[PDB]
PDB file of C-alpha atoms in Angstrom:
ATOM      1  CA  UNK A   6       0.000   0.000   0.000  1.00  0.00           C
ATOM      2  CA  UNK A   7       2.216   2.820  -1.502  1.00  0.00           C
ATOM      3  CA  UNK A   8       3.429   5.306  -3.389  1.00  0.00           C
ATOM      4  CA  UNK A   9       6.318   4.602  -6.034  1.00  0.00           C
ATOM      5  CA  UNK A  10       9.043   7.427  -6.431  1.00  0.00           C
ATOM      6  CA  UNK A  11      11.797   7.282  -9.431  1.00  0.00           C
ATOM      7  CA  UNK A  12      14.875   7.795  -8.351  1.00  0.00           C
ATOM      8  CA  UNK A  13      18.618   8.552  -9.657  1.00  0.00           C
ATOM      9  CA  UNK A  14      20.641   5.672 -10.259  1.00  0.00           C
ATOM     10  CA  UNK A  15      17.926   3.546 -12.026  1.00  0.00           C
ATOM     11  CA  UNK A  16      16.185   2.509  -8.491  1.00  0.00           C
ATOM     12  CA  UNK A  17      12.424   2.938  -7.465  1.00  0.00           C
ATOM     13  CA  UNK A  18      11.384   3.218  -3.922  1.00  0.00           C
ATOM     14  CA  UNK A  19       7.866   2.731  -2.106  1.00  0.00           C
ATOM     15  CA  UNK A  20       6.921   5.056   0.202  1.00  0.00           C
ATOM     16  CA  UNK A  21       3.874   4.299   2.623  1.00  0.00           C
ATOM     17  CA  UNK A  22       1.042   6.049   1.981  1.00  0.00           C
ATOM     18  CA  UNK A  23       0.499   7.029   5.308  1.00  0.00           C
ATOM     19  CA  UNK A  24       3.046   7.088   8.587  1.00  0.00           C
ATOM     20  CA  UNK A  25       3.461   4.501  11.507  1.00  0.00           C
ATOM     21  CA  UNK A  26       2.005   5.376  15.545  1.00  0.00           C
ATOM     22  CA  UNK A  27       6.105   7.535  15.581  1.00  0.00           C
ATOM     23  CA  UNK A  28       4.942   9.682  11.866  1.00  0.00           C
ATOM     24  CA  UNK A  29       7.364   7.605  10.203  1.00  0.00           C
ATOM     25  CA  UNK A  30       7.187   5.908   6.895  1.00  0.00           C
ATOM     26  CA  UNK A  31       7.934   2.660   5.382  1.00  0.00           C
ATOM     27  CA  UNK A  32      10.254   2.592   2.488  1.00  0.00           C
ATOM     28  CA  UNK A  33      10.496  -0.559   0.166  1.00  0.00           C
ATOM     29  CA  UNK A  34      13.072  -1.000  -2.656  1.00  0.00           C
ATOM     30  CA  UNK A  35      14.397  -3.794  -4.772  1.00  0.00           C
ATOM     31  CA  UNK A  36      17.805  -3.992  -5.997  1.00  0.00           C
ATOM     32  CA  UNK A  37      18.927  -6.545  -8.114  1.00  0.00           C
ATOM     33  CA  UNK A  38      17.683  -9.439  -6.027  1.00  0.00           C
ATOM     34  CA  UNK A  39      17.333  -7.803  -2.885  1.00  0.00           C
ATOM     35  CA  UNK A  40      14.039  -6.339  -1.389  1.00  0.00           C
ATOM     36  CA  UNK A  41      15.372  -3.327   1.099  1.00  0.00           C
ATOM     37  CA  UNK A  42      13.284  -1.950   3.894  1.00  0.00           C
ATOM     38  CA  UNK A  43      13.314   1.029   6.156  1.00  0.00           C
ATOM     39  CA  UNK A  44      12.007   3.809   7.663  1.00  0.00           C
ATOM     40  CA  UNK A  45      12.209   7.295   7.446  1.00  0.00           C
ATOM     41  CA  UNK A  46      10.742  10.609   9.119  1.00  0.00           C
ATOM     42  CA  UNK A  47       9.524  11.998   5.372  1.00  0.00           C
ATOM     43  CA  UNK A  48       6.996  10.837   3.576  1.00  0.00           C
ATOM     44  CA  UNK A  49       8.943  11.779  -0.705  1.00  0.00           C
ATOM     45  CA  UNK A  50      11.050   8.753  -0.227  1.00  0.00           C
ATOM     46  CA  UNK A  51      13.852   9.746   1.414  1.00  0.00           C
ATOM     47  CA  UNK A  52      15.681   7.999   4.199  1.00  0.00           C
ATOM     48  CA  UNK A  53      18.015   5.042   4.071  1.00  0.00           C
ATOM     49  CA  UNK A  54      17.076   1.435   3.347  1.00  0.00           C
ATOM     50  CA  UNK A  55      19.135  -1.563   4.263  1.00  0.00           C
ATOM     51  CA  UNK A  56      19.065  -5.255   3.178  1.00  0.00           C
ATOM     52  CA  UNK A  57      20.598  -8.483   3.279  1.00  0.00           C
ATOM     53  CA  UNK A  58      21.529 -10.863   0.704  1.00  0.00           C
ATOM     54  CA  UNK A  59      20.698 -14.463   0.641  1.00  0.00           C
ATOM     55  CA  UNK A  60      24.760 -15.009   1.315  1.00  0.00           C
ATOM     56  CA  UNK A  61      24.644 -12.566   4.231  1.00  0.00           C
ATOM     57  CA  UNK A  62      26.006  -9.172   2.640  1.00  0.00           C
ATOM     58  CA  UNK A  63      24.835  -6.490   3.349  1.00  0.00           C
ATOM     59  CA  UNK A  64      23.074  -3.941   0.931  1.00  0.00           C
ATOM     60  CA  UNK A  65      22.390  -0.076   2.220  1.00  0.00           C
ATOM     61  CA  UNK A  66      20.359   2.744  -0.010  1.00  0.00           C
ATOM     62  CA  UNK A  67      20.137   6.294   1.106  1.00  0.00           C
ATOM     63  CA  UNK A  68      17.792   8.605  -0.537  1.00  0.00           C
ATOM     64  CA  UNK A  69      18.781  12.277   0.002  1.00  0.00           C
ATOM     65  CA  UNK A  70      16.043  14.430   1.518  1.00  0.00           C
ATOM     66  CA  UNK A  71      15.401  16.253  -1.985  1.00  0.00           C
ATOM     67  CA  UNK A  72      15.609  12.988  -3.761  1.00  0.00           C
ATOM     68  CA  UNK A  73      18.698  14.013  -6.119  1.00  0.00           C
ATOM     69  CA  UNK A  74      21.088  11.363  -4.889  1.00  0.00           C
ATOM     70  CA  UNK A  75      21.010   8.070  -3.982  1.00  0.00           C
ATOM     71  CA  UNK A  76      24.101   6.343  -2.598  1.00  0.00           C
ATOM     72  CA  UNK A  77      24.223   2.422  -3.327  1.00  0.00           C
ATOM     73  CA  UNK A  78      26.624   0.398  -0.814  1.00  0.00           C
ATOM     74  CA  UNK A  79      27.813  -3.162  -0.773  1.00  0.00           C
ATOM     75  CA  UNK A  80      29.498  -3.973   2.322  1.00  0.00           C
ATOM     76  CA  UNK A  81      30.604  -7.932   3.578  1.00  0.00           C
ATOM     77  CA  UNK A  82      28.502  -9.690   5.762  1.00  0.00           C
ATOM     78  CA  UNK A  83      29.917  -7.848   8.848  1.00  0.00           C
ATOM     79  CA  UNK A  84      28.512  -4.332   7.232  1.00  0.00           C
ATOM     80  CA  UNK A  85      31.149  -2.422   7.972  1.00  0.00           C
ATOM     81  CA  UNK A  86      34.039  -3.664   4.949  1.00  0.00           C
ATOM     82  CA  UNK A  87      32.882  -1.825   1.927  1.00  0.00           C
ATOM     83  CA  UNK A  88      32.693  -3.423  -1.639  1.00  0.00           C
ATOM     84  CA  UNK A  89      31.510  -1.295  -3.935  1.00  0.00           C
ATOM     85  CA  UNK A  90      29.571   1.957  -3.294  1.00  0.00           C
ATOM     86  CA  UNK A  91      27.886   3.724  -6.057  1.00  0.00           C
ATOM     87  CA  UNK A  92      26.430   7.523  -6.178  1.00  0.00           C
ATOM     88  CA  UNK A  93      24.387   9.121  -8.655  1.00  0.00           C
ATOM     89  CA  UNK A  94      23.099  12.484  -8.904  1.00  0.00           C
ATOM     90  CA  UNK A  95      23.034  15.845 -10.935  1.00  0.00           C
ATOM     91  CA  UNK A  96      22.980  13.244 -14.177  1.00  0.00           C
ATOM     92  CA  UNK A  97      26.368  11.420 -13.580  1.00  0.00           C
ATOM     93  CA  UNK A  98      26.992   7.741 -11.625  1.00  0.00           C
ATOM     94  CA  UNK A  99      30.081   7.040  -9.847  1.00  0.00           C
ATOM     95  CA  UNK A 100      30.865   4.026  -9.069  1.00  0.00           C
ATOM     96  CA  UNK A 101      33.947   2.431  -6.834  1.00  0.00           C
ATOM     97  CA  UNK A 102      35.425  -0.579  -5.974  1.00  0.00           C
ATOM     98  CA  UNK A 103      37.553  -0.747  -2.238  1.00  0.00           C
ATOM     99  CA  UNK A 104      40.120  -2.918  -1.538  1.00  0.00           C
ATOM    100  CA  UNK A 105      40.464  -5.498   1.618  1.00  0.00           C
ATOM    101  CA  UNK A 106      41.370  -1.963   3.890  1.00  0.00           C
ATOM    102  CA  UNK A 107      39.138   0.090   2.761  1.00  0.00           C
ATOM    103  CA  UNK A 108      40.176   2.742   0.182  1.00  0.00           C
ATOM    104  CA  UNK A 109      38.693   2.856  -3.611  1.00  0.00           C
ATOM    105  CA  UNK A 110      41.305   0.857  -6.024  1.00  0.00           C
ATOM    106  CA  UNK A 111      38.584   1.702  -8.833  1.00  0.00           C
ATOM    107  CA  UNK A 112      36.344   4.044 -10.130  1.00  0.00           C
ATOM    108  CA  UNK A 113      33.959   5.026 -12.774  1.00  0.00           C
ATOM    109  CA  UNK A 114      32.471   7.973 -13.431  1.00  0.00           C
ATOM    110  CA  UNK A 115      29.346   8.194 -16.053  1.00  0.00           C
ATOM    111  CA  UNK A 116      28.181  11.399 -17.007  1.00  0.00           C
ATOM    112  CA  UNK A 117      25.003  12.253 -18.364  1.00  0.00           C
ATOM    113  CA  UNK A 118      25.441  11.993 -21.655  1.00  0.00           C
ATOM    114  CA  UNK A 119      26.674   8.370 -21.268  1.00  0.00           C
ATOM    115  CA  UNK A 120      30.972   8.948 -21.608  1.00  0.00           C
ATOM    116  CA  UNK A 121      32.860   7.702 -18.704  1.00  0.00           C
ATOM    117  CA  UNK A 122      36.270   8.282 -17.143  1.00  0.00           C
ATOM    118  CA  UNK A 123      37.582   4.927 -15.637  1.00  0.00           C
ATOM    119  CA  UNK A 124      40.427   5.153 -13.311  1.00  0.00           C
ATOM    120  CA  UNK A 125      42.199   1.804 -12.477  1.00  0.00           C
ATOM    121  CA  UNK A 126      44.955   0.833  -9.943  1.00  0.00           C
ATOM    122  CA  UNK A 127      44.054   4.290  -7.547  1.00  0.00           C
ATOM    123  CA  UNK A 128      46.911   4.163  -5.040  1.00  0.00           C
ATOM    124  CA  UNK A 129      47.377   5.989  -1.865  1.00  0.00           C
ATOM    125  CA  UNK A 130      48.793   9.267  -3.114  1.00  0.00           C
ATOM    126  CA  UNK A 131      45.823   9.819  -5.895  1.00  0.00           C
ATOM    127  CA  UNK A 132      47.782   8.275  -8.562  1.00  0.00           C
ATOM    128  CA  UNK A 133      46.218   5.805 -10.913  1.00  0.00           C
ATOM    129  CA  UNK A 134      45.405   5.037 -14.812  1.00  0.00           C
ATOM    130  CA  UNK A 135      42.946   6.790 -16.745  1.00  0.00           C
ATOM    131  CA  UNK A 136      40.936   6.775 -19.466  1.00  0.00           C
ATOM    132  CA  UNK A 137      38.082   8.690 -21.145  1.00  0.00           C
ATOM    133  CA  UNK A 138      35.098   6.711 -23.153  1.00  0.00           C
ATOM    134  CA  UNK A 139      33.766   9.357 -25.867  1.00  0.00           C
ATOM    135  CA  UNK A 140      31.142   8.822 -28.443  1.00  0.00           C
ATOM    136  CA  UNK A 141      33.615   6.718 -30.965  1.00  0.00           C
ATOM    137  CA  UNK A 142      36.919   6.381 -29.140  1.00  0.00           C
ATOM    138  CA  UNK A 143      38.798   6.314 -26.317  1.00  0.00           C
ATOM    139  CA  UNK A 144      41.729   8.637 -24.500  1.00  0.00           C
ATOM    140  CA  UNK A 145      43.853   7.152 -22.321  1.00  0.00           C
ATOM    141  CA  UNK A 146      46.336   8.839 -19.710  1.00  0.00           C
ATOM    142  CA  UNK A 147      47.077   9.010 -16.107  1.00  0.00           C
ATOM    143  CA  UNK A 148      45.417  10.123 -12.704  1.00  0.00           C
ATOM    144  CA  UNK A 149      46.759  12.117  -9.646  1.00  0.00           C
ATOM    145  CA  UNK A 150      45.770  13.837  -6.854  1.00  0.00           C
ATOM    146  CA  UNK A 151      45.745  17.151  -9.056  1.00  0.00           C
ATOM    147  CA  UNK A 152      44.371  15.999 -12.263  1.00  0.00           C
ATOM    148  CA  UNK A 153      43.747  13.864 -14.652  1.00  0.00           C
ATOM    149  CA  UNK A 154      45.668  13.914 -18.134  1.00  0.00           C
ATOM    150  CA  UNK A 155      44.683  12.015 -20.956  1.00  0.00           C
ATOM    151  CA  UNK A 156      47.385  12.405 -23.762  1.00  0.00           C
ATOM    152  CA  UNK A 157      47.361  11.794 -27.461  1.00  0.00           C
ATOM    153  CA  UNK A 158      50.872  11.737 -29.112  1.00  0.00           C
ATOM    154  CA  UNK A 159      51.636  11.958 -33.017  1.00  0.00           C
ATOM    155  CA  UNK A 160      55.194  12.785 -33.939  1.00  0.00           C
ATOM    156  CA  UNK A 161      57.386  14.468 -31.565  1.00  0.00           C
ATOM    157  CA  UNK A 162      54.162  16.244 -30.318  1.00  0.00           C
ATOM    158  CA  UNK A 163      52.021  15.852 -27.049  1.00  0.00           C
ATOM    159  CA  UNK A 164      48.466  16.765 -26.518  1.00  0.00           C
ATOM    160  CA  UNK A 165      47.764  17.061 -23.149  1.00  0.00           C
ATOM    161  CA  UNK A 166      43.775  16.982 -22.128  1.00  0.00           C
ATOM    162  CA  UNK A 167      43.579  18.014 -18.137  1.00  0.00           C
ATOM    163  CA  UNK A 168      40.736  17.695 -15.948  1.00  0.00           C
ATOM    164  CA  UNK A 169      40.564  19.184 -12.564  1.00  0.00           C
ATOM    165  CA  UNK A 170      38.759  17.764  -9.484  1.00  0.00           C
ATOM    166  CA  UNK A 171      35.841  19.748 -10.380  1.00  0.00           C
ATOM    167  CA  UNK A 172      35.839  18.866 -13.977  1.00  0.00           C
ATOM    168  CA  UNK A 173      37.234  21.729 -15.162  1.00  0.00           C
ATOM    169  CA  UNK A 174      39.089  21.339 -18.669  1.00  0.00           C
ATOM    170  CA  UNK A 175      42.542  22.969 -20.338  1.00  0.00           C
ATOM    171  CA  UNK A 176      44.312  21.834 -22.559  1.00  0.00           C
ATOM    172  CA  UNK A 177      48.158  21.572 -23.542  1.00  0.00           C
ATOM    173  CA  UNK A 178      50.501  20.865 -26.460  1.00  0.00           C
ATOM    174  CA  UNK A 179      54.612  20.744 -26.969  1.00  0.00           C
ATOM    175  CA  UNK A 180      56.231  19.573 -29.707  1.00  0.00           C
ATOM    176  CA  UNK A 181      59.952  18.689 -29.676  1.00  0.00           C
ATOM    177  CA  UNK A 182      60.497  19.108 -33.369  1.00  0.00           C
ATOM    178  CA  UNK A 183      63.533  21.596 -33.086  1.00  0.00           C
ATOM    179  CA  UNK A 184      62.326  22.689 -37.070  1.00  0.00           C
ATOM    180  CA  UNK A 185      61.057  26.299 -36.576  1.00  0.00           C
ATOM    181  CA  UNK A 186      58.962  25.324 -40.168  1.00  0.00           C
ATOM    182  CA  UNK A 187      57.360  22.702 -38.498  1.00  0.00           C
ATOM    183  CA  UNK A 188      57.006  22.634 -34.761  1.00  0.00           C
ATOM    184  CA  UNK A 189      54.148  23.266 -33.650  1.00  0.00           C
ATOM    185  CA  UNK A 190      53.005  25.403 -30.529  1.00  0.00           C
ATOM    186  CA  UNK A 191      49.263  26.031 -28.858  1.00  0.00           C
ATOM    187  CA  UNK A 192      47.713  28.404 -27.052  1.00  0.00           C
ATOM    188  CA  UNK A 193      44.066  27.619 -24.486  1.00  0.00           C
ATOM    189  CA  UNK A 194      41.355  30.004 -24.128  1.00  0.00           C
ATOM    190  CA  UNK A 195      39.257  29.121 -21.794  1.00  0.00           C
ATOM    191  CA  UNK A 196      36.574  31.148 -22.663  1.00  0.00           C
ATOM    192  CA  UNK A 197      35.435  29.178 -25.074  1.00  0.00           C
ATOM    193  CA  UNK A 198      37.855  25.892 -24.452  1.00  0.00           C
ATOM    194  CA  UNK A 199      39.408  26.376 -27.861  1.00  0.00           C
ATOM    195  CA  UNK A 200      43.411  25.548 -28.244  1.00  0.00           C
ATOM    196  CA  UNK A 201      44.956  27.365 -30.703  1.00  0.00           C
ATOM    197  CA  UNK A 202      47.264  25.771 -32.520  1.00  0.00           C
ATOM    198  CA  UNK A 203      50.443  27.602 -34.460  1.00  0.00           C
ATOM    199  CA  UNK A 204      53.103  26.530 -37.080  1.00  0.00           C
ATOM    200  CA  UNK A 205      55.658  28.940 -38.448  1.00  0.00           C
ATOM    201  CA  UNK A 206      53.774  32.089 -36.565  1.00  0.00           C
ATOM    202  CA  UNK A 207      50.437  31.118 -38.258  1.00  0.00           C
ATOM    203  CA  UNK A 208      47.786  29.777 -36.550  1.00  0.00           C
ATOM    204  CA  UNK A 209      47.033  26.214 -38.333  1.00  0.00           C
ATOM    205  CA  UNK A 210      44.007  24.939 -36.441  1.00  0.00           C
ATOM    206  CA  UNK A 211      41.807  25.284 -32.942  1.00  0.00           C
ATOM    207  CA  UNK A 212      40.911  22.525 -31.057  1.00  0.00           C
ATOM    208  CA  UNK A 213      37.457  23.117 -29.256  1.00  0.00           C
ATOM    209  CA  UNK A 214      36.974  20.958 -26.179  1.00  0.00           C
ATOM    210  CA  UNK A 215      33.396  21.288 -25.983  1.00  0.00           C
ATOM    211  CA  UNK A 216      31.209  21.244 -22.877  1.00  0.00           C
ATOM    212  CA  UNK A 217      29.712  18.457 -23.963  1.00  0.00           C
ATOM    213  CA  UNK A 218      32.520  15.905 -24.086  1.00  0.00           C
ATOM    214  CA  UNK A 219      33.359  15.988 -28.027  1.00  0.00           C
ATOM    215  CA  UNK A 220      36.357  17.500 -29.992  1.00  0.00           C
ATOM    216  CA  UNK A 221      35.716  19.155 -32.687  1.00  0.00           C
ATOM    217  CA  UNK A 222      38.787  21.065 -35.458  1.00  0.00           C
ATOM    218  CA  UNK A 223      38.673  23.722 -37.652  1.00  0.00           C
ATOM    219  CA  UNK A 224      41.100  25.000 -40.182  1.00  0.00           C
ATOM    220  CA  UNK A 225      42.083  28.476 -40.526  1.00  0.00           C
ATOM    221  CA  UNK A 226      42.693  29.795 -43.802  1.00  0.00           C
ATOM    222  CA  UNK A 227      46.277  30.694 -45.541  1.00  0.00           C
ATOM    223  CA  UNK A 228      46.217  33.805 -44.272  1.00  0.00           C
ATOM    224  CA  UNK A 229      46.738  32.380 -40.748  1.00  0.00           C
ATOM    225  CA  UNK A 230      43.991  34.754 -39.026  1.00  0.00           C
ATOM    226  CA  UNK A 231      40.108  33.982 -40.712  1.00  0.00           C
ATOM    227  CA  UNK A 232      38.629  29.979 -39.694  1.00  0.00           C
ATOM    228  CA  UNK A 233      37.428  28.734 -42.550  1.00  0.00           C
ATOM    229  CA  UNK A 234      35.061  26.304 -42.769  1.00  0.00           C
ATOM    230  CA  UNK A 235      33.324  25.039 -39.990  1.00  0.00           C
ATOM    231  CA  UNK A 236      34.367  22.800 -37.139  1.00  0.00           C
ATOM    232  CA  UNK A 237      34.130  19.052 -37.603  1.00  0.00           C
ATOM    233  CA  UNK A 238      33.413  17.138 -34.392  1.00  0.00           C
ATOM    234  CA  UNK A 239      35.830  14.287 -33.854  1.00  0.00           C
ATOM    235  CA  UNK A 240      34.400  10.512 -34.346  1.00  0.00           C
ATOM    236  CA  UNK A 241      37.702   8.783 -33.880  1.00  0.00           C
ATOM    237  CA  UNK A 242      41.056   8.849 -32.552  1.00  0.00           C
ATOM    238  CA  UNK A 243      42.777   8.726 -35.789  1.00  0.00           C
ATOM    239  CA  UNK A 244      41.008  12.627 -35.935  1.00  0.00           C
ATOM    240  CA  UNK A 245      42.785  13.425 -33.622  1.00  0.00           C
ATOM    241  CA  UNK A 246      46.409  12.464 -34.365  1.00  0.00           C
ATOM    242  CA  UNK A 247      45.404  13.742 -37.748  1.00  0.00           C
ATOM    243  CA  UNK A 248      44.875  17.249 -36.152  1.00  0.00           C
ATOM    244  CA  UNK A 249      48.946  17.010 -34.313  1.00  0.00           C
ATOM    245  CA  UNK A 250      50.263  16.317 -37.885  1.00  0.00           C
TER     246      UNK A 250
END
């Protein structure tokens, strides 16, 4: 005798229709195999469910008060050694994996258009492996504490693809060609997350890392100074090393 209520992170509670003798409410949830139960003091769905599985883990769902995250955890039988513990909200999933004492070895992020960043082998100073999942291919790079970097190379040049803590983008190049004809240098604007990209004092090409997780490149003319064209979003990797040539 409920109410259903969507939630974030594919999940569907039930919320009582009405309140216990104490004004609280019972929540019901499955997950995977697992019915959860709980109670809660507010009657939208919020409040934290737990449950155990037919093998004795333990399962635990909490519902923010506003409903815009839920926070999946899978802890051992005991309840207290974390598995895996997965958060979604705002549109993006995060998902980790803990090792036997307790800090995340693995994580993957999903954002809400459905690219990922997968970090693998997370140590204890914030280092790790990274890589992003775009619509068509894949960057890989590194993690730390700082940043993560996700580098293409082609040549003796290095595009460098940083994201801060926040998500914040810039972007970097270097070449080591020591050809003043050929090498190339870059420049980042942030205002519109374009990097510039110079050979022989004329600007060849800009880079726009777009808000919504593509590359795209356009050409400027001869003249070094008018685009031409317009920008071509990036389906593959190949695009990419094309663009470093």
């Amino acid at each position: 005798n409920s109410v259903s209520v969507d939630l974030p992170g594919s999940m569907k509670v039930l919320v009582s229709k009405s309140s216990n003798a104490d004004g609280k409410y019972d929540l019901i949830a499955t997950v995977d195999a697992l019915e959860l139960s709980g109670t809660s003091d507010k009657n939208n769905g919020s409040g934290v469910l737990e449950g155990v599985k037919a093998d004795a883990s333990k399962v635990k769902l909490t519902i923010s008060d506003d409903l815009g995250q839920t926070t999946l955890e899978v802890f051992k039988s005991d309840g207290s050694t974390l598995v895996s513990k997965k958060v979604t909200s705002n549109g993006s999933s995060t998902e980790e994996k803990f090792n036997e004492k307790g800090e995340v070895s693995e994580k993957i992020i999903t954002r809400a258009d459905g690219t990922r960043l997968e970090y693998t082998g997370i140590k204890s100073d914030g280092s790790g492996k990274a890589k992003e999942v775009l619509k068509g291919y894949v960057l890989e790079g590194t993690l730390t504490a700082e940043k993560t970097t996700l580098v293409v190379k082609e040549g003796t040049v290095t595009l460098s693809k940083n994201i801060s803590k926040s998500g914040e983008v810039s972007v970097e190049l270097n070449d080591t060609d020591s050809s003043a004809a050929t090498k190339k240098t870059a420049a980042w604007n942030s205002g519109t997350s374009t990097l510039t990209i110079t050979v022989n004092s004329k600007k060849t090409k800009d880079l726009v890392f777009t808000s919504s997780n593509t590359i795209t490149v356009q050409q400027y003319d001869s003249n070094g100074t008018s685009l031409e064209g317009s920008a071509v979003e990036i389906t593959k990797l190949d695009e990419i090393k094309n663009a470093l040539k």
